[PDB]
C-alpha cells in the first residue's frame, strides 16, 4: 500500500493511496515430514546451535605473557551489528576493541 503526501499541504497529509497484490519470492514449503524438495532432491535444514547473543566474561587462563597472569575479557555480542570487546593488559589495564 503506497501513501503519497500532497506537496501543497503541510507535512503529513494524503494526496491519494493505492494498493495491489504484489508478488515477491517463491519460498519453499516444508512437507508433512520435514523435507524441503528443492530440485527434485529432498533436502533438510539442520538446526544450528550457535553462541547466544548477549554479554560474556571469559579469561585465557594464563596462556599469555607467561607471568601466571589471567587476563579477563568481556564480550558484547549482538544478534545483528558490530561486536564489542573489553580485555585486560597484563599491566592491569582495560582495553576496548571493536570488530
Amino acid at each position: 500500500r503506497l501513501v503519497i503526501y500532497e506537496r501543497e499541504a503541510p507535512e503529513g497529509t494524503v494526496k491519494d493511496i493505492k494498493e495491489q497484490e504484489v508478488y515477491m519470492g517463491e519460498i519453499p514449503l516444508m512437507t508433512d515430514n520435514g523435507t524441503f524438495v528443492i530440485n527434485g532432491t529432498e533436502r533438510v535444514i539442520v538446526s544450528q546451535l550457535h553462541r547466544s547473543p548477549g554479554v560474556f566474561f571469559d579469561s585465557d587462563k594464563g596462556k599469555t605473557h607467561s607471568s601466571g597472569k589471567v587476563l579477563y575479557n568481556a564480550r558484547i555480542i549482538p544478534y545483528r551489528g558490530s561486536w564489542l570487546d573489553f580485555e585486560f593488559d597484563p599491566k592491569d589495564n582495560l582495553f576496548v576493541r571493536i570488530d
Binding site: 491519494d16 493505492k18 495491489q20
Partner: protein
C-alpha cells in the same frame, strides 16, 4: 555640477539610495572620476565583485583591479595556486601607495588578514622606471632590508651606491642590476654582470616576486617550529605537518597555518590602505559578514578535530565582525543601498528609477510595442548598451524595424537632450536617471519572461451534471469516474491509518482489483458516470505502466558493409594521390597572418602534414592531441596549401555549434586571400542550401564546412582535394568513408581529441599516419581530479568551494526523467546556490535562454545531461560534478574534463562513484585509468586505455569498439592487395559509380550476399561487380546458376538480390528512375522522358485513388499493405509488367 558631496572625514558615513540594477557602477565611476584618490569597493560576494569587475570598466577609464583572493575554503586542504599568490602580493606591493585606481575586494578577503609588511618590504622588489625616487632613500631601504654596501656586488644581500648609479644583488636572483638614478627618479634597469659589470638586459619594470607570501627559509622554519611547539603538540608521525615542514617540503593547506610563519600579530590589510582612501559599500556588510563569520566558526569546529593537521583559532586568521566595524570607523565610508532613505545630512537619494516594462514576444503581432510606444514619449536621451559587437547588429536591424538609429559613443556623459545611442560595455540592467532624463537600457531588459507552458487538466473544466455535485449518497457498485485515472467500481468508505493520522477514504476498484482510496475531504475529484452504460462500463488499469514493452527480437544485417569497405580501400590503394605544390613565400605570407609562434612539435606536425600533402601518395594522417593544444591552425596551414592548388577543401564536423566556431575561425584567418568560405547545416535555409550546394559544382566556394549534410548523396564537388574531419570519435565508419567513396585518392586529414580504438589501431598498424601533439602554448592547468563515493556533504563542500570562488558549476546527471527531482534534491542540499535546469529535450528556446542566462551569470549551478559535451565557452564554469560516473564513455570523460579549465584559475573535477563492488569491473578499469592520468599530453595514452579494454573493432566492418574475433590484419592486408591487383588487373570500374548509375530500387528489404554463402570477400566483390554490370536477364540467370554451381543452393538474400537486379533491368529499360518501397507502399518516380501510358495511368488513378496518387508529375505514391515481402516483390513485378504492357 555634480549631484552630491562626498565623505571626507575620519569616520563619516555617506548614505546613498534609490539604486536599481547596474546604476551603482556608473555612480562609482563618477566617484573615481571626481575624487583624486583611490576607490576601494567592498563587495558583498565574489560573484557581484566579478560582475562589478566588468561593470565599472564599462563606465570609466581608470585602471581597475580585484585583489586576488585565495580561492580555497576556510581551513581547506588546497594550496591557493602560487601564481594567484604572485598576483596577490604584487597588488599588495603597490597597495601602500597607489594614488588613483579602483580596487574591488570582497568581505571574504577584507575580513582576512595579510602579511606583516616586514617580509614584503624586505624580501621582495618590484620597481618600474616611472618611479620618482632618490638614491639614499633606496640605499636606506636596502639597509633596512639588511643588505650590505659592497661596491663590486657578487653576493646575495649586497648592493652598491656610487655617485648616481646604484646596484643590487638580491635574495631572489643570482644577478645584480644597475639603477642610475636621475632627477629623483629611476632611469635604468641594467642587468649587469656579477663581476664584468656590463649590462645583459635593459628593463623597464623589474619583477622580483617572492615564491610565497610567507617566509620559507631555515630561520623561518625553526621560528615556525618554535611556534608550533608552543601552541600545538607534536606527535611522532611522518605525515604530521610539524615533521612535514621540518623536512622542508610543504602540504597543500599550509598557508592557513599563516601566523606561525611570522611570530607577529597580523595586519588586517587596513595597514595597506593609502592615506585618504574612499571606501564604497554595496548591498550591506552587516548581513554577509555575520553569516560568513558563522560559516567560518562552524567550519572551524567542524575541523577542530583530527590531530593530523590541527588548526589555529580563527581569531588570528581573521578579524572578528566587531573588529571590522571598529576599523570601519577609521575611514570615510560610502554606503550605497537599494531603497529610499528619508532625509538627513550625509544622505541623498538620487533619481534612479527602474525601467518600465519593456519586453519582446512573438505572441503579439508587432513585437516592439512597448519600446515603440515608449521611445517617442521618453523626452530624454536613450542608450542601448549592447554587450557584444556582433550582437550590436542583432540590435541594428532590430531597432531598424522600429526605424530608430543607434550612434556608437564611448562615454555616458555624451548624452544630448534627446538622442539614441548604442553603448558597447558589460551592463546587465537599465534605469532612468530622472535628474537629466537619461535612460540606459540593457540587452537583458528585453526578454524578461523565461516561462514554460501548462497542459492537461481537461475534466476539471467538465463541471457538468455528471459531477453529481458531491451528493455523498452514492451506492456501492456505482461505476465512477476519477479524472486522473478513469472509471472504477465504488466499493464503500473505509478507515485507514496514514502515519499517525487516521482517516476515512472512498475505496474504489480499478482493473486487476487494485484499490484506490481517495480522501473524503477532496470529494470533488470524483464524478458520477456520464455514458449511461452503468452495467456496461469499462475499467481502467491504474498506473498505466507499460514498460514491459521493451522485450526482444529485432534483426539486423539488412546491408553488408565489409565488401564495400574493401572496395573503397582497394580503390584508394589502386589509384595515386595528388602531388601538391608548395610555395615558400606565398606560404610564408600566410604564416605571417598567424599572430602567434608555433610550438616546435606543432611546427613539425605542420611540416609532416605539408611534406605528405605534396607527395604522389594519399594523405591519411591522425593529428591526435589534447584539446586546446592548437590543432586548428595546423588545418589552416594545410588548407592554405591545398586551396592555392585549387582543390576545393571540404570541412566536416559532427554538430552545428562546432561548425559555427569553425566558420569564424576560417573566415577570420583567411582574411586576405581570394578564397570564399561557407558553411551548411540545418540552420541554413533551403533556399540558401539550394544555391550553396549547386554552386559547389560550379566551385567558387573553395572551403565548405558542415555537419552530415555534406554526406547526403547530392553534394558534388567539382574537384575534391582535401578532406578535413574534426572531433573524430563519432561518424561510425560509413559516414567516415562515404566522402572518400566520391574520390578514391582524396587526401584525408583527421583531427581528434582522443581517437576511437579502431582508428587508433589502424593508424598504429601502419595503415594510416599518426602525428601526436603535446606541450600547450599557454601554461594551462591539470585540473585536479578525484574519484570518490557519493556523499551529501562532499558534494556540498565542492559546491561551496566553487560558489565562494564566484564561478559556476556544471553538475551533470544525464537522465531527463528525474532531473527535475534531482534539482531540488541538490537545491535544499545547498540552499544558497542558484539552480536552473537544462537538457537537450526542451522546446529549443528555453534551452538557449538557460545557456545565455548562464553566460550572463544569472545563476550558479546548472543541472544537465551531456548537452554540455558540445563544448561551449564560459570558462567561469570551473567544476564538473558527474553524479553517476559509472555509465559514461571514457573518451567523453576526458572531453568533460576538458570542459572545465580554460583559465588561469585552478579548475576542479569530482567524479562521483557508486560503491566499488557494486559497479562493473570495466567501470573500475575506466576509473582507475582516469585516476592514474591527470596531466597535459595524457589524452592519447588515455585513448590507449580506451583501446585494449574494449577491443579495437573489426578492421573490415562497422563497430569501432569491440573484440568481435575479426579479420586478422595480415590476412586483411592480403585480401586488400588481392583486391588491388585484381582491380588494376584490367581497369575495373569502381563499384561506387555502379551505385550511382543504378536506379534507386530501395525496398527496405535485406538484399545482399551473406558471408556463409561466400567467405572470400574478393569473390563476393567480383560477383557484385558482375551482377551490377550485367545487362541481360540471360546473364543474370547465368550468374545465378554459376553461383548455384559453386555453392549449392541459393539462399533468400541471394534470390532477393538477383530479382532486384532483374527489376533494375526493366527500371532502366523504361525510365523508372527512383523506386522506393516499404511496408506501407512506396514511391515510383519516372524519368522526364518516361514510358508511362499517361491515359492508362490516369485510369489507374481513377480506378484506385487509395492505391495510386500522383503527388507530383512523375511521383506516384502507391499505398499497399505489403506485409509479405514476397507479395511486395510480386506486386512491383506485376506492376511494371503492366507498365511495359502499356509502354510507349
Amino acid at each position: 555640477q555634480y549631484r552630491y558631496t562626498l565623505p571626507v572625514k575620519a569616520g563619516e558615513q555617506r548614505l546613498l539610495g534609490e539604486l536599481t540594477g547596474a546604476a551603482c557602477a556608473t555612480l562609482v565611476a563618477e566617484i573615481a572620476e571626481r575624487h583624486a584618490g583611490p576607490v576601494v569597493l567592498i563587495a558583498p560576494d565574489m560573484q557581484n565583485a566579478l560582475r562589478l569587475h566588468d561593470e565599472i570598466s564599462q563606465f570609466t577609464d581608470q585602471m581597475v583591479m580585484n585583489l586576488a583572493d585565495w580561492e580555497t575554503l576556510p581551513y581547506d586542504s588546497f594550496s591557493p595556486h602560487q601564481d594567484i599568490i604572485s598576483s596577490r602580493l604584487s597588488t599588495l606591493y603597490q597597495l601602500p601607495t597607489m594614488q588613483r585606481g579602483v580596487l574591488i575586494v570582497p568581505v571574504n578577503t577584507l575580513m582576512q588578514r595579510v602579511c606583516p609588511h616586514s617580509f614584503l618590504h624586505g624580501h621582495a622588489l618590484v620597481m618600474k622606471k616611472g618611479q620618482r625616487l632618490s638614491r639614499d632613500a633606496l640605499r636606506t631601504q636596502l639597509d633596512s632590508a639588511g643588505y650590505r654596501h659592497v661596491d663590486q656586488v657578487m653576493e646575495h644581500g649586497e648592493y652598491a651606491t656610487r655617485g648616481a648609479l646604484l646596484d643590487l644583488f638580491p635574495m631572489g636572483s643570482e644577478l645584480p642590476y644597475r639603477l642610475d638614478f636621475f632627477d629623483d627618479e629611476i632611469d635604468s634597469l641594467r642587468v649587469f654582470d656579477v663581476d664584468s659589470q656590463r649590462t645583459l638586459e635593459e628593463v623597464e619594470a623589474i619583477n622580483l616576486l617572492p615564491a610565497h607570501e610567507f617566509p620559507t627559509d631555515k630561520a623561518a622554519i625553526e621560528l615556525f617550529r618554535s611556534q608550533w611547539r608552543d601552541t600545538f603538540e607534536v606527535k611522532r608521525d611522518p605525515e604530521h605537518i610539524y615533521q612535514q615542514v621540518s623536512k622542508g617540503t610543504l602540504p597543500a593547506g599550509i598557508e592557513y597555518w599563516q601566523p606561525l610563519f611570522f611570530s607577529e600579530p597580523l595586519p588586517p590589510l587596513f595597514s595597506y590602505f593609502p592615506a585618504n582612501t574612499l571606501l564604497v559599500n554595496t548591498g550591506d556588510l552587516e548581513t554577509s559578514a555575520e553569516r560568513f563569520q558563522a560559516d567560518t566558526l562552524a567550519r572551524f569546529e567542524n575541523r577542530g578535530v583530527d590531530p593530523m593537521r590541527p588548526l589555529l583559532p580563527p581569531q588570528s586568521l581573521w578579524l572578528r565582525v566587531d573588529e571590522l566595524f571598529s576599523e570601519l570607523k577609521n575611514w570615510p565610508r560610502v554606503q550605497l543601498k537599494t531603497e529610499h532613505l528619508p532625509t538627513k545630512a550625509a544622505n541623498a537619494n538620487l533619481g534612479f528609477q527602474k525601467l518600465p516594462d519593456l519586453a519582446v514576444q512573438a505572441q503579439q503581432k508587432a513585437p516592439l510595442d512597448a519600446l515603440r510606444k515608449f521611445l517617442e514619449t521618453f523626452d530624454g536621451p536613450v542608450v542601448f548598451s549592447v554587450e557584444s559587437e556582433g550582437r550590436r547588429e542583432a540590435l541594428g536591424e532590430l531597432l531598424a524595424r522600429i526605424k530608430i538609429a543607434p550612434q556608437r559613443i564611448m562615454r555616458l556623459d555624451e548624452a544630448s537632450d534627446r538622442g539614441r545611442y548604442l553603448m558597447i560595455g558589460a551592463a546587465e540592467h537599465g534605469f532612468v536617471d530622472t535628474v537629466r532624463n537619461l535612460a540606459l537600457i540593457c540587452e537583458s531588459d528585453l526578454l524578461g519572461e523565461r516561462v514554460a507552458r501548462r497542459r492537461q487538466d481537461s475534466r476539471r473544466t467538465i463541471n457538468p451534471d455528471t459531477l453529481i455535485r458531491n451528493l455523498a449518497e452514492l451506492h456501492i457498485g456505482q461505476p465512477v469516474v476519477h479524472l486522473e485515472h478513469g472509471v472504477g467500481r465504488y466499493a464503500g468508505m473505509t478507515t485507514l491509518e496514514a502515519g499517525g493520522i487516521t482517516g476515512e477514504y472512498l475505496m474504489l476498484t480499478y482493473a486487476n482489483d487494485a484499490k484506490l482510496y481517495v480522501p473524503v475531504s477532496s470529494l470533488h475529484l470524483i464524478s458520477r458516470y456520464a455514458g449511461g452504460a452503468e452495467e456496461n462500463a469499462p475499467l481502467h488499469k491504474l498506473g498505466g505502466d507499460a514498460w514491459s514493452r521493451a522485450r526482444q527480437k529485432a534483426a539486423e544485417k539488412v546491408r553488408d558493409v565489409a565488401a564495400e569497405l574493401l572496395d573503397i580501400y582497394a580503390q584508394r590503394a589502386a589509384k595515386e594521390g595528388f602531388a601538391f605544390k608548395h610555395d615558400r613565400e606565398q606560404y610564408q605570407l600566410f604564416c605571417d597572418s598567424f599572430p602567434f609562434e608555433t610550438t616546435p612539435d606543432q611546427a613539425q606536425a605542420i611540416n609532416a602534414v605539408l611534406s605528405d600533402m605534396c607527395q604522389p601518395l594519399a594523405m591519411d594522417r591522425l593529428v591526435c592531441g589534447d584539446v586546446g593544444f592548437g590543432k586548428t591552425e595546423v588545418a589552416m596551414r594545410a588548407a592554405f596549401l591545398a586551396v592555392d592548388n585549387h582543390k576545393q577543401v571540404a570541412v566536416l564536423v559532427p554538430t552545428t555549434l562546432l561548425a559555427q566556431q569553425h566558420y569564424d575561425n576560417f573566415r577570420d584567418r583567411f582574411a586576405n586571400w581570394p578564397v570564399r568560405i561557407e558553411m551548411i547545416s540545418r540552420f541554413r535555409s533551403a533556399k540558401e542550401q539550394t544555391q550553396i550546394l549547386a554552386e559547389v559544382a560550379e566551385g567558387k566556394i573553395d572551403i565548405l564546412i558542415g555537419t552530415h549534410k555534406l554526406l547526403q548523396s547530392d553534394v558534388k564537388f567539382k574537384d575534391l582535394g582535401l578532406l578535413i574531419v574534426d572531433e573524430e570519435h563519432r561518424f561510425g565508419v560509413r559516414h567516415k568513408e562515404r566522402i572518400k567513396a566520391m574520390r578514391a585518392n582524396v587526401d584525408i586529414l583527421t583531427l581528434t581529441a582522443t581517437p576511437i580504438p579502431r582508428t587508433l589501431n589502424m593508424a598504429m598498424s601502419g595503415m594510416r599516419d599518426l602525428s601526436i601533439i603535446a606541450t600547450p602554448p599557454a601554461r594551462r592547468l591539470a585540473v585536479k581530479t578525484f574519484v570518490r563515493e557519493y556523499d551529501s556533504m562532499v558534494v556540498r563542500e565542492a559546491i561551496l568551494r566553487e560558489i565562494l570562488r564566484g564561478g559556476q558549476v556544471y553538475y551533470l546527471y544525464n537522465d531527463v526523467e528525474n532531473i527535475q527531482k534531482a534539482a531540488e534534491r541538490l537545491a535544499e542540499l545547498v540552499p544558497e546556490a542558484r539552480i536552473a535546469i537544462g537538457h537537450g529535450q526542451m522546446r529549443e528556446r528555453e534551452l538557449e535562454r538557460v545557456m545565455n542566462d548562464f553566460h550572463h551569470q544569472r545563476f550558479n549551478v546548472l543541472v544537465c545531461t551531456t548537452i554540455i559535451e558540445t563544448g561551449i565557452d564560459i570558462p567561469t564554469a570551473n567544476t564538473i560534478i558527474i553524479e553517476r560516473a559509472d555509465h559514461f564513455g571514457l573518451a567523453q570523460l576526458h572531453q568533460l574534463r576538458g570542459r572545465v579549465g580554460r583559465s588561469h584559475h585552478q579548475a576542479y573535477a569530482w567524479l562521483l562513484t557508486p560503491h566499488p563492488k557494486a559497479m562493473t569491473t570495466d567501470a573500475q578499469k575506466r576509473l582507475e585509468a582516469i585516476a592514474s592520468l591527470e596531466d597535459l599530453g595524457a589524452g592519447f595514452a588515455l585513448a590507449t586505455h580506451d583501446l585494449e579494454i574494449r577491443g579495437a573493432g573489426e578492421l573490415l566492418g562497422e563497430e569501432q569498439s569491440g573484440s568481435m574475433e575479426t579479420i586478422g590484419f595480415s590476412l586483411y592486408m592480403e585480401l586488400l592487395e588481392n583486391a588491388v591487383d585484381a582491380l588494376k588487373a584490367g581497369r575495373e570500374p569502381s563499384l561506387e559509380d555502379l551505385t550511382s548509375q543504378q536506379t534507386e530500387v530501395e525496398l527496405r528489404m535485406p538484399s545482399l550476399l551473406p558471408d556463409d554463402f561466400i567467405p572470400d570477400v574478393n569473390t563476393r566483390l567480383s560477383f557484385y561487380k558482375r551482377i551490377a554490370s550485367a545487362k541481360t536477364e540471360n546473364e543474370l540467370e547465368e550468374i545465378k546458376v554459376e553461383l548455384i554451381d559453386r555453392f549449392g543452393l541459393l539462399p533468400d538474400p541471394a534470390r532477393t538480390l538477383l530479382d532486384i537486379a532483374r527489376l533494375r533491368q526493366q527500371a532502366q529499360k523504361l525510365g523508372i528512375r527512383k523506386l522506393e518501397g516499404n511496408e506501407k507502399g512506396g514511391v515510383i518516380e519516372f524519368a522526364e522522358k518516361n514510358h508511362v501510358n499517361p491515359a492508362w495511368l490516369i485510369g489507374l488513378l481513377q480506378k484506385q485513388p487509395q492505391h495510386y496518387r500522383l503527388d507530383g508529375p512523375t511521383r506516384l505514391k502507391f499505398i499497399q499493405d505489403l506485409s509479405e515481402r514476397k507479395t511486395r516483390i510480386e506486386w512491383v513485378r506485376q506492376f511494371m509488367r503492366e507498365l511495359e504492357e502499356n509502354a510507349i
